[PDB]
């Protein structure tokens, strides 16, 4: 929850032991009280300008949550926070050395370093590992 946005990547993994600062917990403690049924204690009393906007607000709260669970769901990394993969890093993506990425770098600058290359990494996890391991697992159950 953005408390370490000026910290470094080699140090922000220390405070990330809290559940991304209880990231998703702020949603459930919100939608317990977003679903205060005073909206149902009125039926909004009409259709109003705000309730049009709240309806377009809750949808984005639904969709953009799902696009982050699905991508974690497909990567063999459902529900975890720090998982490793089988994909080898290609040095053509970034010729930065080891410590400069971790000890000597922010996060948002590192986004603009590989925002070009990000989409290639997405395919190169699924079709390289999570499509792939499931067949090789199923072969190991053939016996």
């Amino acid at each position, epitope marked *: 929850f953005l408390g370490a946005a000026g910290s470094t990547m080699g140090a922000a993994s220390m405070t990330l032991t809290v559940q991304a600062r209880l990231l998703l917990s702020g949603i459930v403690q919100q939608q317990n009280n977003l679903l205060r049924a005073i909206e149902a204690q009125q039926h909004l009393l009409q259709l109003t300008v705000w309730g049009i906007k709240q309806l377009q607000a809750r949808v984005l709260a639904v969709e953009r949550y799902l696009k982050d669970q699905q991508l974690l769901g497909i990567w063999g990394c459902s529900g975890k926070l720090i998982c490793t993969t089988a994909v080898p890093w290609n040095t053509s993506w970034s010729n930065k050395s080891y410590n400069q990425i971790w000890n000597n770098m922010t996060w948002m600058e590192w986004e603009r370093e590989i925002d*070009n*290359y990000t*989409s*290639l990494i*997405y*395919t190169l996890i699924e079709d390289s590992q999570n499509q792939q391991e499931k067949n090789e697992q199923e072969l190991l159950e053939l016996d």
Partner: antibody, heavy 134, light 109 residues
Framework: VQLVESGGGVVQPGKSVRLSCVVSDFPFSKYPMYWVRQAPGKGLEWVAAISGDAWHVVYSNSVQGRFLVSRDNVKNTLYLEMNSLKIEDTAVYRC????????????????????????????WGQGTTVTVSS | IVMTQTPLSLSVTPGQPASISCKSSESLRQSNGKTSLYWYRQKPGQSPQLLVFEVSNRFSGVSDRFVGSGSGTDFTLRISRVEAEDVGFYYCMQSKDFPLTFGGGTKVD
């Protein structure tokens, strides 16, 4: 920066030479290149283009299949090899850099196909000249 | 695609404004949000130099009196108070797709 060529001159039909454009200071693997052909007393004709990673090559239809281009990002060179020469290829060749920077290839999600962006030119080399005659 | 221009010869003297337009067959508007038409100038006996890259922006070492505009098909480059060293040619160059062509190059004396 500095941008010239080499290997120019005059040859016969059916021959084959290769020029050599050399850049000076900018990071050469970052940028794509081009080739243009100004005929004497005429306008300009586009010839060729290479990607920055030397993977994408697009030729003109008239000189399709005959010529050859390549890169060497370490040696910062730029080659235009040519084959099956004709007399109407006698003109001024110019080495030229893209104006903007280019990125890496894009890979649209919906179809597994990359995309190399291509935009026009700012730095024309003064260029050699090849003449095809007897 | 095809893209020619007009007029070929404008033999003038300094002190007056004029304009050179390049006419487009295929309309140009790429999906990035811009129209890839590049206007630039050679001198006689010289490799050319960039006047303006886009029809909006300019390049370094360019006088302020070099203005350009146009629709997706109409395209116009206007030179206010045409300067004494405006000799040579003026090519209109597009960058839609391949093969990317040119104009003939309008001679200005």
């Amino acid at each position: 920066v500095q941008l010239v060529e080499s290997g120019g001159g005059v040859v016969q039909p059916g021959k084959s030479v290769r020029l050599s454009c050399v850049v000076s200071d900018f990071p050469f693997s970052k940028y794509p290149m081009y080739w243009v052909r100004q005929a004497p007393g005429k306008g300009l004709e586009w010839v060729a283009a290479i990607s920055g990673d030397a993977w994408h090559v697009v030729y003109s239809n008239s000189v399709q299949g005959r010529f050859l281009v390549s890169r060497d990002n370490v040696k910062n060179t730029l080659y235009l090899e040519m084959n099956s020469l004709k007399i109407e290829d006698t003109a001024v060749y110019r080495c030229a850099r893209m104006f903007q920077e280019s990125g890496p290839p894009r890979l649209d999600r919906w179809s597994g196909r990359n995309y190399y962006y291509y935009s026009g030119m700012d730095v024309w080399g003064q260029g050699t000249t090849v003449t095809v005659s007897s | 695609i095809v893209m020619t221009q007009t007029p070929l010869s404008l033999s003038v003297t300094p002190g007056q404004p004029a304009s050179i337009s390049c006419k487009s067959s295929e309309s140009l508007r790429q999906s990035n949000g811009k129209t890839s038409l590049y206007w630039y100038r050679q001198k006689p006996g010289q490799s050319p130099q960039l006047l303006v890259f886009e029809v909006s922006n300019r390049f370094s070492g360019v006088s302020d009196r070099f203005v350009g505009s146009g629709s997706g098909t109409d395209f116009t480059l206007r030179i206010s108070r045409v300067e004494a060293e405006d000799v040579g040619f003026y090519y209109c160059m597009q960058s839609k797709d391949f093969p990317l062509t040119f104009g003939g190059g309008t001679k200005v004396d």
